[PDB]
A paper describes a structure:
Site-one protease (S1P, also known as Membrane-bound transcription factor site-1 protease (MBTPS1), or Subtilisin kexin isozyme 1 (SKI-1)), is a membrane-bound protease that mediates the proteolytic activation of transcription factors, hormones, and enzymes required for lipogenesis, the endoplasmic reticulum (ER) stress response, and lysosomal biogenesis, among others. A zymogen serine protease, S1P matures through autoproteolysis of two pro-domains, with one cleavage event in the endoplasmic reticulum (ER) and the other in the Golgi. We recently identified the SREBP regulating gene, (SPRING), which enhances S1P maturation and is necessary for SREBP signaling. SPRING activates S1P by dislodging its inhibitory pro-domain and stabilizing intra-domain contacts.
We determined the structure of the SPRINGecto-S1Pecto complex to 2.3 Å using cryo-electron microscopy (cryo-EM). The Peptidase S8 protease harbors a catalytic triad of D218, H249, and S414 and the oxyanion hole residue N3383,16. We did observe density for a putative calcium molecule in the GIFT subdomain within an acidic pocket near the GIFT-Protease interface. Our cryo-EM map for S1Pecto-SPRINGecto shows density for a 7-sugar tree at S1P N515, the form of N-linked glycan that is homogenously produced in HEK GnTI- cells. SPRINGecto presents a cysteine-rich fold that we term the Cysteine-rich enabler of S1P activity (CREST) domain (residues 36-205). The final model for SPRINGecto contains residues 76–138 and residues 165–196. SPRINGecto makes protein-protein contacts with all three subdomains of C-form S1Pecto and the total binding surface between S1Pecto and SPRINGecto is ~1200 Å2. SPRINGecto binds a somewhat hydrophobic ridge beginning at the GIFT subdomain, running along the protease, and terminating at the P-like subdomain. In contrast, S1Pecto co-expressed with SPRINGecto forms a stable heterodimeric complex lacking the cleaved S1P A-domain and efficiently cleaves an exogenous SREBP2 peptide.
Residue numbers in the entry:
A (entry chain A): 190 to 591, 598 to 933
B (entry chain B): 74 to 138, 165 to 196
Amino acid sequence: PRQVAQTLQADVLWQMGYTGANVRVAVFDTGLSEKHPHFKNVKERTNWTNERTLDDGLGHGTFVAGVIASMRECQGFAPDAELHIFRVFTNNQVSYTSWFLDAFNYAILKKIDVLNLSIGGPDFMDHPFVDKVWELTANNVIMVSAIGNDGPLYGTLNNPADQMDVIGVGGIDFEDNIARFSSRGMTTWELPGGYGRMKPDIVTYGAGVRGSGVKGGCRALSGTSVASPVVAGAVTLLVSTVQKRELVNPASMKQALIASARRLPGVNMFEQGHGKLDLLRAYQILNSYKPQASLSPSYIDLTECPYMWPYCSQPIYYGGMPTVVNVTILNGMGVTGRIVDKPDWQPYLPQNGDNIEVAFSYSSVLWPWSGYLAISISVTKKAASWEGIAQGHVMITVASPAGAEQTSTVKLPIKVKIIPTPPRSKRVLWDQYHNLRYPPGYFPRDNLRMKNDPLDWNGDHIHTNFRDMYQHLRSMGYFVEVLGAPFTCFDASQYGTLLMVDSEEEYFPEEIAKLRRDVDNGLSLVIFSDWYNTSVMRKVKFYDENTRQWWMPDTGGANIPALNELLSVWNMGFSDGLYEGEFTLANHDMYYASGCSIAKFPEDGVVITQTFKDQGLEVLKQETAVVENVPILGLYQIPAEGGGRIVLYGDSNCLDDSHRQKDCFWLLDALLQYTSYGVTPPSLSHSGNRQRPPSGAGSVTPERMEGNHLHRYSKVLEAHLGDPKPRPLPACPRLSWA
Amino acid sequence: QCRNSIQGKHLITDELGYVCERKDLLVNGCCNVNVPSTKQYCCDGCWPNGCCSAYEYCVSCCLQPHFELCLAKCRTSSQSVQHENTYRDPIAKYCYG
Ligand SMILES: *[C@@H]1O[C@H](CO)[C@@H](O[C@@H]2O[C@H](CO)[C@@H](O[C@@H]3O[C@H](CO)[C@@H](O)[C@H](O)[C@@H]3O)[C@H](O)[C@H]2NC(C)=O)[C@H](O)[C@H]1NC(C)=O
Ligand SMILES: [Ca+2]
């Protein structure tokens, strides 16, 4: 049978006397048995749950500990590792963040070198937890964490594996293929204004790996909760191999794993990281390593890929939104660093490297053991018609305390592709600014049937849970840039269409006025709405165990009252009735997951309506009812000459990737064609499902649920708690190109 | 040699009590006493209830006339949160009493 440790040539390092000796490993899991025979060096087991037992009822903590440090019948990487067992989950995999805080305090107290966290969470706004993790890494704790078992959907990264100071470990099968369960995508802390970093850091074997059984023997498990312990054991063995232990810090260890990693062919860097763990090359790199700074990715090649997806899925032109690469600076010279000067952007005149201007944003202090360097790359005015590879290198001098500063000068190659600006139509502005989501507040699932996932938490970015939709658009020719700022902060003459999908945010009055001016000037709007209903919202309240609190939705599927405030300037509106069911449009199947209807639409709209199920009645009184002629989609061209277009659709799940049933990528393509070219889509204007556009007369308009708390998580509304009002319009972000 | 609060993004507190920026940290782990910004046992930002906006100032106030004890007691813990994921005092999340 398979031996995970042997397959990664852990034996070749066992022959050298390096077996994880004098390396402290902590396992944050469901616990371990008292006298498990697969371990010789389990120092202590601690229970931080409310269940009165240190033992492992599920067998997960035992398997993790075995993979890391098993000696019998299925060996771990570091048999001589000092195992520390932290039972912070119950038999059902339930853990309170306060228990995590206490356990992490304990871990820092014990000075553990490697910490495996196989089960994370989507709540990266759990500020006590994230502060604790930063505190942990700052204290010289190499934290290996599983990126999560919520793949292959992008935007599914789990905290703390998504932190710059934590080794995120994804899962491959023993054939070196990324495991289906393995989480993917960029970090989403930085949305909407920013861009996400590169995760996972590395990917190792996490499917079918044999590990210790609860009482003995071995059994096969799967998940990044399995890949994470493999990397943790490999890191423990590597720590034992290095001669100078002072050279071993989270940054140096991460850098050894990053440089020695074997790049998987055909896998983008946001699925694999730098590659699969290579233990022997990692040993060699640690052997030759000296304290230095480095960059993840270490080069910015918007051409070389699939490794550099999404950065190669489109080239950069003039007038495009700045291309932001969040480069993780790994500084092995000290826990705190400092960028010495404004990084020196040295272009290459010989090969046309001066067609790029690179602005730099970055940490004032590089901490803990790392930091960020957001490089905003923008073409110049001269290159607005110049195709080609612009090449330069960004020289970053990271300095760290000693007396002389530990100057590490790092070259960041920047090899970007450049093209002339596309027409208005090809450029699509995806609205990220008006998206609200979990972690912060309870924004319910866009599909009420999906009881398993009751939160909208996958970022809703074109590279996170709309990755399939974005890839579809790229294959369709659309260049999809992201609006991370209010409507007032983008040149509407650049874009033919603005795509607002499952928007939960409010709107500034200045935002509404500017958007109306944009629409009159030629900007188009594609508003993929989602369900809203005060009664369904009240019935869909759920008990969050993490907080031990009864959560009510802050808004429905989409902020239908706010969207109606925005749309009132065009006489349009949305209803509050829940509707659902399979249907068809222009010979294409569909699925209305959980959406609202168009309560109010002007007379000249090219509307389409069909029959669905009154899912609101199902939610409230568990009854059944089919609703005749529920308008779900509406088209409207503004009469003003050179005016925009507005498409209204009631559900957002046909584009999301979370739990897709059917596909409307065809319909979104048609709607973008409508909003960017004017030609009417026959799939809806010659459809037999047309009808008189509604009027909203007599139908009570949806209202914000009494006592809602959306203002607590709104960039637009102040947390006034009494008649909340929009904040003053914020100043548009600006960059000083270097 | 001084046992310094390794965590500090900006500040550092040694076993003596000096709170110093990260630019004023000596090789032996001690803070730069000569620089005026290095004041020891500084309770700056510490509210009367015993909570401070900075972990290192929390440690320094906790060291007022135990270094590991102050380091541990000033880390955000179970009692520092309500509903498990929100501070009972975000502006003073580091409490020594
Ligand atoms: C690259 O990734 C990093 C890590 O996620 C991003 O760092 C975050 O950047 C924001 C900037 O908006 C920082 O905001 C903070 O705001 C407070 C407000 O008082 C300010 O006092 C802080 O000094 C800081 O500016 C945030 O702290 C920071 N987070 C971390 C962990 O460093 C960064 O935004 C990304 N680069 C982009 C999006 O260009
Ligand atoms: Ca959304």
